[PDB]
Nucleic acid binder design. Structure first.
Ligand SMILES: [Mg+2]
Ligand SMILES: [Mg+2]
Ligand SMILES: [Mg+2]
Ligand SMILES: [Mg+2]
Ligand SMILES: [Mg+2]
Ligand SMILES: [Mg+2]
Ligand SMILES: [Mg+2]
Ligand SMILES: [Mg+2]
Ligand SMILES: [Mg+2]
Ligand SMILES: [Mg+2]
Ligand SMILES: [Mg+2]
Ligand SMILES: [Mg+2]
Ligand SMILES: [Mg+2]
Ligand SMILES: [Mg+2]
Ligand SMILES: [Mg+2]
Ligand SMILES: [Mg+2]
Ligand SMILES: [Mg+2]
Ligand SMILES: [Mg+2]
Ligand SMILES: [Mg+2]
Ligand SMILES: [Mg+2]
Ligand SMILES: [Mg+2]
Ligand SMILES: [Mg+2]
Ligand SMILES: [Mg+2]
Ligand SMILES: [Mg+2]
Ligand SMILES: [Mg+2]
Ligand SMILES: [Mg+2]
Ligand SMILES: [Mg+2]
Ligand SMILES: [Mg+2]
Ligand SMILES: [Mg+2]
Ligand SMILES: [Mg+2]
Ligand SMILES: [Mg+2]
Ligand SMILES: [Mg+2]
Ligand SMILES: [Mg+2]
Ligand SMILES: [Mg+2]
Ligand SMILES: [Mg+2]
Ligand SMILES: [Mg+2]
Ligand SMILES: [Mg+2]
Ligand SMILES: [Mg+2]
Ligand SMILES: [Mg+2]
Ligand SMILES: [Mg+2]
Ligand SMILES: [Mg+2]
Ligand SMILES: [Mg+2]
Ligand SMILES: [Mg+2]
Ligand SMILES: [Mg+2]
Ligand SMILES: [Mg+2]
Ligand SMILES: [Mg+2]
Ligand SMILES: [Mg+2]
Ligand SMILES: [Mg+2]
Ligand SMILES: [Mg+2]
Ligand SMILES: [Mg+2]
Ligand SMILES: [Mg+2]
Ligand SMILES: [Mg+2]
Ligand SMILES: [Mg+2]
Ligand SMILES: [Mg+2]
Ligand SMILES: [Mg+2]
Ligand SMILES: [Mg+2]
Ligand SMILES: [Mg+2]
Ligand SMILES: [Mg+2]
Ligand SMILES: [Mg+2]
Ligand SMILES: [Mg+2]
Ligand SMILES: [Mg+2]
Ligand SMILES: [Mg+2]
Ligand SMILES: [Mg+2]
Ligand SMILES: [Mg+2]
Ligand SMILES: [Mg+2]
Ligand SMILES: [Mg+2]
Ligand SMILES: [Mg+2]
Ligand SMILES: [Mg+2]
Ligand SMILES: [Mg+2]
Ligand SMILES: [Mg+2]
Ligand SMILES: [Mg+2]
Ligand SMILES: [Mg+2]
Ligand SMILES: [Mg+2]
Ligand SMILES: [Mg+2]
Ligand SMILES: [Mg+2]
Ligand SMILES: [Mg+2]
Ligand SMILES: [Mg+2]
Ligand SMILES: [Mg+2]
Ligand SMILES: [Mg+2]
Ligand SMILES: [Mg+2]
Ligand SMILES: [Mg+2]
Ligand SMILES: [Mg+2]
Ligand SMILES: [Mg+2]
Ligand SMILES: [Mg+2]
Ligand SMILES: [Mg+2]
Ligand SMILES: [Mg+2]
Ligand SMILES: [Mg+2]
Ligand SMILES: [Mg+2]
Ligand SMILES: [Mg+2]
Ligand SMILES: [Mg+2]
Ligand SMILES: [Zn+2]
Lengths: 138, 124, 99, 99, 208, 83
RNA sequence: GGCUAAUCCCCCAUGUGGACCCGCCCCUUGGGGUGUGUCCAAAGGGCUUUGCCCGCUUCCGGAUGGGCCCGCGUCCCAUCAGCUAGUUGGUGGGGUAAUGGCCCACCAAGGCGACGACGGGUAGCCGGUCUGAGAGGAUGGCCGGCCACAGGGGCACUGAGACACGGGCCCCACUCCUACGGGAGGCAGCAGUUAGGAAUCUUCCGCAAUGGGCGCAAGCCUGACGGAGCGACGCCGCUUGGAGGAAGAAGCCCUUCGGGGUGUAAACUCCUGAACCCGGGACGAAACCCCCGACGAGGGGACUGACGGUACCGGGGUAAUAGCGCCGGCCAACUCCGUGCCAGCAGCCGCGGUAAUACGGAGGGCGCGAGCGUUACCCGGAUUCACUGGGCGUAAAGGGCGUGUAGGCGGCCUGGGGCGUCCCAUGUGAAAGACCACGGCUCAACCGUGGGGGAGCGUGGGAUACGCUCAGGCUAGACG
């Protein structure tokens, strides 16, 4: 069995971007869909869309990269420099509203699952709620 | 270790073990001498070091180094123990306070008199 | 507020008394994971109403005896013997790990 | 030496021999009543019970047998007297108790 | 008791001119003139490249010797400045400038820092009508720093204020030369002081 | 007996008292119930005595007994003044 | 053995009221009301003696203070794995202010344990304190809160309250008295003695303040306390001068013998005036008390100091303690001489067996400065027990392999619950400390006033993404 779908999706994205792929198929679920929506709104991925692979539902995450570079290693700069699951099964993480971290001095995001839905750090702070600290992205 | 493993067993604090059982944890400990001896040092050095076996007020029997150039210490004189080992003499884990109880300070010592315990001279 | 807990009646064998098992979740104070510990309270059953495997509420009471400071407030959910079987199996496992 | 707090100790002993005495009387009357209730003599047991209740309240008047300890003794006494009386009861006097 | 002894040897050891002699660190006699090298037998020898700790230490020493304080009050005032809101270096400099004796020197009542410390210590100085003999006394903005009328007849004070005619005073200060008054207008900023010291080096020194 | 008295909270040669409601059986500098004023004998400030009268009026209505000095200070702020 | 008083004790009466058995009602564990029956009260003293004051009795309530109970938290060893006979529960009883195996009799055979029982080791706990970027580690002296003990062990009496430090009984050890039969003791109260130890103070002053006990008050008591003394033990402030003064005295040091250094440092010129002398000289102190008004309010008045003639103000006035560590690298500061694997230094690396910047002295220098070093201990660095924040192919580390128990972890969709989770309100989080602001001692240390913050837990309300749970559904995992 697959034991952490959210971390699995994050790692699919991490590997796909580390080899500069165009898209990636992640097994589909509403919670993953919300995470992907937050990513697309924050500009980390070009986007995503529902798809069917051999009858089973999946999510095509279309990733984005920087421009091609000079000198040796012309591989473009990554847009998702870093992705890291935080609250994983076996050690769940919950933060209050004063405990919401500032990711990379604001240049990054923290995705929270809260009573009011899945938000970013800024969104949860302006909303004034805390919740499960899912992942850092920057 | 998993988090569950750390909940079940957890990290183990590391105990320190005192290098100096000059007991009661006291800074100094007075005693009576048994032997005043000259001992040969370890491999890389060569000299004649003046040490003293001591019976202590804590019921302990140790060996202490005699600092300075010359000492008035004898077989049955009382002395104070300061602590601190001598790298090149295995066995002596303690030092001797000079200028205390029988062990007069180093005569004609003019540079470092806090250590070696000698009074301030006069300049005519 | 007299404390009210919820547990499963795990032992019947006493007169006018039941042994209830009450669970409790809380985050570990350093490692943060949600750990689940349980405790057996002795509840006072005056009418012998409650039987083994029942899920009842327990209420803080004026002491009935030594180790007895709680009374069975009411029945919540009657007759789930799986938790009782878990307790019995855990206790039976003590036959090993001795010599 | 020779602190006059000694006086207190002296007084103490006095007070002891007072309290003791009173207390003993109470007990010797109480049994005297209960026995007669056990043997089916309503009037005599009632009379002794009234005397015992009076003695108990008088001991409560002083530092001997003060707050609700006296009510305890009176309650237990009247309970045992009325209960023991119910063997061909016939509450003859009817004074000590409420009808 | 602060440092008491030969001073211009510290003009030399720090390599920079620090006028704690008052005058004569102006006239060509400071011994920084025609002898800029440090004191001792090895003064005129080549200087080996100093480590980072050496640079930080010499900078902090330069500052402390300039203001003439002991290391104890120096470090305690530094911690005080570190706890306050604002840049630690500029706040530290302003607190050092707030010292009563340093203010007496800044107002030109004394020729040097040590002379100002003595004029304070002996009660010749007035603060808001009252006398203060504590050189470590801190002057708040708005306080009036004058000379007690008992000491107004003194020849040294009249000499110093005779030379103070036409001379200019710090922008965060002001004084009336005839009535011997004076006013600590505001705390001086980093620019207000011409101190030949890099305060960031002192901050980095106390980092360890 | 709950009382109203003074607790010396200054320093050596600098006495500063807290007018305080406390059980008489505790230390004079120990734990108290309510702090209902402060007294400064040297009178080094414009305000050297404050009371918060109505609280003292309450605690007197329930049976607190002030010290002669405490009663003096309470009357000085007019806890008893009834016109 | 005898006499005698009372706010000592007893009996009767009065029953506002209260207590108790039984009945009823409302509440719901023994809360409140009610009916009859039974039982229960008391003390006088003082004056300005016709009125008031100090008291006394029963009761309801308030307040403060406590008793008992419960959730949760509270060190090490598993080379401590089984523990348990009042032990677990019941009925009745005893005891208490009060629940209770708290104790007792009888009945049942239970209770606890790997979620650390039992055993052993260590240890008063907390507010806080030290350190640390923080998490965390360590600690709990002093001040404040709670606990426990009063030579060791047990026991009760008196009382609202003790199982009572300066109360009592008994056993035990010790010291003293002893007519040998028997007695008296209890500083872990303030000083002080002695022992032990590296080491920790005066057999001080005082009731003037603050607080306590008794008293109508006057007042008495108070080694609580307020002060003083001793000790650089800590913190803070201060002095040992300031300015002028030689391309630069002697001495000492090095030298390429030309000189360089100590160095404006000294001498010396002038000025200021630590100490000490002289005089004035406190705040802390206003009530209690007196008197007017009714011993109230209010108004006004007067007695009251240990510190101490100290602090402080005014006048006069002398240039008037410097020491300690270090100078090979870490680490800031270098040369000469002397010693030659000796004598010695040493935190680690390491120096010294003939030029030693590392030994010893000198000169000079660096660091601090009434301190400076040393030892011990705690944290730190140490991300070296790694939650933040580490690892296991060859460096320490994958268990010889499997089966599987407890436990940990759990695919997709919908819904109910709202336990975790989150939010709001509120209660609590004492004071001191910490933080911020203002202020009081000439400044600070110190202290006051005010403000802010705060994890956790209680209660009420709300949110439902995730975790959980319950119900239903699906087939991608699993099995067939
Ligand atoms: Mg050798
Ligand atoms: Mg049963
Ligand atoms: Mg029972
Ligand atoms: Mg078993
Ligand atoms: Mg008496
Ligand atoms: Mg009898
Ligand atoms: Mg009693
Ligand atoms: Mg700052
Ligand atoms: Mg300005
Ligand atoms: Mg630092
Ligand atoms: Mg008390
Ligand atoms: Mg009133
Ligand atoms: Mg007689
Ligand atoms: Mg007689
Ligand atoms: Mg008679
Ligand atoms: Mg009477
Ligand atoms: Mg009567
Ligand atoms: Mg009636
Ligand atoms: Mg009646
Ligand atoms: Mg037994
Ligand atoms: Mg039995
Ligand atoms: Mg039975
Ligand atoms: Mg019972
Ligand atoms: Mg458990
Ligand atoms: Mg112990
Ligand atoms: Mg800190
Ligand atoms: Mg602790
Ligand atoms: Mg303690
Ligand atoms: Mg003490
Ligand atoms: Mg004991
Ligand atoms: Mg005892
Ligand atoms: Mg009494
Ligand atoms: Mg009692
Ligand atoms: Mg006791
Ligand atoms: Mg005693
Ligand atoms: Mg006593
Ligand atoms: Mg006796
Ligand atoms: Mg001794
Ligand atoms: Mg003292
Ligand atoms: Mg008094
Ligand atoms: Mg008094
Ligand atoms: Mg009178
Ligand atoms: Mg006396
Ligand atoms: Mg005292
Ligand atoms: Mg000394
Ligand atoms: Mg100092
Ligand atoms: Mg020369
Ligand atoms: Mg000079
Ligand atoms: Mg003069
Ligand atoms: Mg006065
Ligand atoms: Mg006055
Ligand atoms: Mg009159
Ligand atoms: Mg009046
Ligand atoms: Mg008086
Ligand atoms: Mg006097
Ligand atoms: Mg003077
Ligand atoms: Mg001189
Ligand atoms: Mg160096
Ligand atoms: Mg050395
Ligand atoms: Mg030679
Ligand atoms: Mg040589
Ligand atoms: Mg050699
Ligand atoms: Mg050398
Ligand atoms: Mg060295
Ligand atoms: Mg040397
Ligand atoms: Mg020197
Ligand atoms: Mg020291
Ligand atoms: Mg360490
Ligand atoms: Mg660590
Ligand atoms: Mg660290
Ligand atoms: Mg290690
Ligand atoms: Mg880790
Ligand atoms: Mg490692
Ligand atoms: Mg190998
Ligand atoms: Mg290996
Ligand atoms: Mg293997
Ligand atoms: Mg192996
Ligand atoms: Mg399972
Ligand atoms: Mg799931
Ligand atoms: Mg589960
Ligand atoms: Mg909820
Ligand atoms: Mg709150
Ligand atoms: Mg606070
Ligand atoms: Mg405060
Ligand atoms: Mg001020
Ligand atoms: Mg809530
Ligand atoms: Mg909902
Ligand atoms: Mg749901
Ligand atoms: Mg299902
Ligand atoms: Mg199918
Ligand atoms: Zn100069």
């Amino acid at each position: 069995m697959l034991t952490d779908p959210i971390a699995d999706m994050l790692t699919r994205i991490r590997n796909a971007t580390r080899v500069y792929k165009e898209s990636t198929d992640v097994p589909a679920s509403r919670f993953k869909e919300e995470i992907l929506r937050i990513l697309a709104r924050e500009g980390f991925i070009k986007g995503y869309e529902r798809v069917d692979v051999d009858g089973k539902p999946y999510l095509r995450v279309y990733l984005k990269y920087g421009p091609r570079r000079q000198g040796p290693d012309p591989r473009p700069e990554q847009v998702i420099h870093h992705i890291r699951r935080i609250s994983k099964p076996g050690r769940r993480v919950y933060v209050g509203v004063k405990e919401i971290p500032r990711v990379r001095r604001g240049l990054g995001i923290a995705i929270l699952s809260t009573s009011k839905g899945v938000l970013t750090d800024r969104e949860a702070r302006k909303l004034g709620v805390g919740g499960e600290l899912i992942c850092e992205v920057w | 270790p998993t988090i569950n493993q750390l909940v079940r067993k957890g990290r183990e604090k590391v105990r320190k073990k005192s290098k100096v059982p000059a007991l009661k944890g006291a800074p100094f400990r007075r005693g009576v001498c048994t032997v005043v001896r000259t001992v040969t040092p370890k491999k890389p050095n060569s000299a004649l070091r003046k040490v003293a076996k001591v019976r202590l007020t804590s019921g302990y029997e140790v060996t202490a180094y005699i600092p300075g150039e010359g000492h008035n210490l004898q077989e049955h004189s009382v002395v104070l123990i300061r602590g601190g080992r001598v790298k090149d003499l295995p066995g002596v884990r303690y030092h001797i306070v000079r200028g205390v109880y029988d062990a007069a300070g180093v005569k004609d010592r003019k540079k470092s008199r806090s250590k070696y315990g000698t009074k301030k001279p006069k300049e005519a | 507020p007299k404390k009210v807990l919820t547990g499963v009646v795990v032992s019947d064998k006493m007169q006018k008394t039941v042994t209830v098992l009450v669970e409790r979740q809380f985050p570990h104070p350093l490692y943060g994971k949600v750990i689940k510990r349980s405790k057996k309270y002795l509840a006072h059953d005056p009418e012998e109403k409650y039987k083994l495997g029942d899920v009842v509420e327990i209420i803080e009471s004026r002491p009935i005896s030594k180790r007895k400071r709680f009374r069975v407030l009411r029945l919540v959910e009657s007759g789930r013997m799986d938790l009782v079987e878990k307790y019995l199996i855990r206790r039976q496992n003590y036959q090993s790990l001795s010599k | 030496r020779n602190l006059s707090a000694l006086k207190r100790h002296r007084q103490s002993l006095k007070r002891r021999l007072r309290n003791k005495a009173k207390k003993s009387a109470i007990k010797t009357l109480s049994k005297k009543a209960i026995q007669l209730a056990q043997e089916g003599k309503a009037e005599e047991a009632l009379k002794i019970m009234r005397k015992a209740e009076s003695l108990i309240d008088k001991a409560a008047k002083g530092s001997t047998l003060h707050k609700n300890a006296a009510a305890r003794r009176k309650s237990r006494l009247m309970r045992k007297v009325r209960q023991l009386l119910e063997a061909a009861g016939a509450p003859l006097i009817g004074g000590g108790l409420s009808a | 008791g602060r440092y008491i002894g030969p001073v211009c040897r510290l003009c030399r050891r720090e390599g920079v001119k620090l006028y704690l002699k008052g005058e004569r660190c102006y006239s060509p006699k400071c011994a920084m003139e025609r002898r800029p090298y440090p004191p001792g037998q090895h003064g005129q020898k080549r200087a080996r490249r100093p480590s980072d700790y050496a640079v930080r230490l010499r900078e902090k020493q330069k500052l402390r010797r300039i203001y003439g304080i002991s290391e104890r009050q120096f470090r305690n005032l530094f911690e005080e400045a570190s706890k306050k809101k604002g840049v630690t270096g500029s706040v530290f400099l302003g607190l050092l400038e707030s010292r009563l004796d340093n203010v007496v020197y800044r107002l030109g009542f004394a020729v040097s820092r040590r002379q100002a410390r003595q004029l304070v210590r002996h009660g010749h100085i007035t603060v808001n009508g009252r006398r203060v003999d504590l050189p470590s006394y801190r002057v708040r903005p708005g306080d009036e720093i004058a000379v007690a009328e008992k000491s107004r007849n003194l020849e040294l004070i009249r000499q110093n204020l005779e030379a103070m005619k036409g001379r200019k005073v710090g922008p965060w200060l002001s004084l009336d030369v005839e009535g011997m008054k004076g006013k600590f207008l505001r705390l001086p900023d980093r620019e207000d002081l011409a101190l030949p010291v890099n305060e960031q080096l002192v901050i980095e020194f106390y980092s360890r | 007996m709950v009382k109203i008295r003074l607790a010396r909270f200054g320093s050596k040669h600098n006495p500063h008292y807290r007018i305080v409601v406390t059980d008489a059986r505790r230390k004079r500098d120990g734990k108290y119930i309510e702090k209902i004023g402060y007294y400064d004998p040297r009178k080094t400030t414009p305000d050297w005595l404050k009371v918060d009268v109505e609280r003292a009026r309450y605690w007197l209505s329930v049976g607190a007994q002030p010290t002669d000095t405490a009663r003096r200070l309470l009357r000085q702020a007019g806890v008893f003044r009834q016109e």
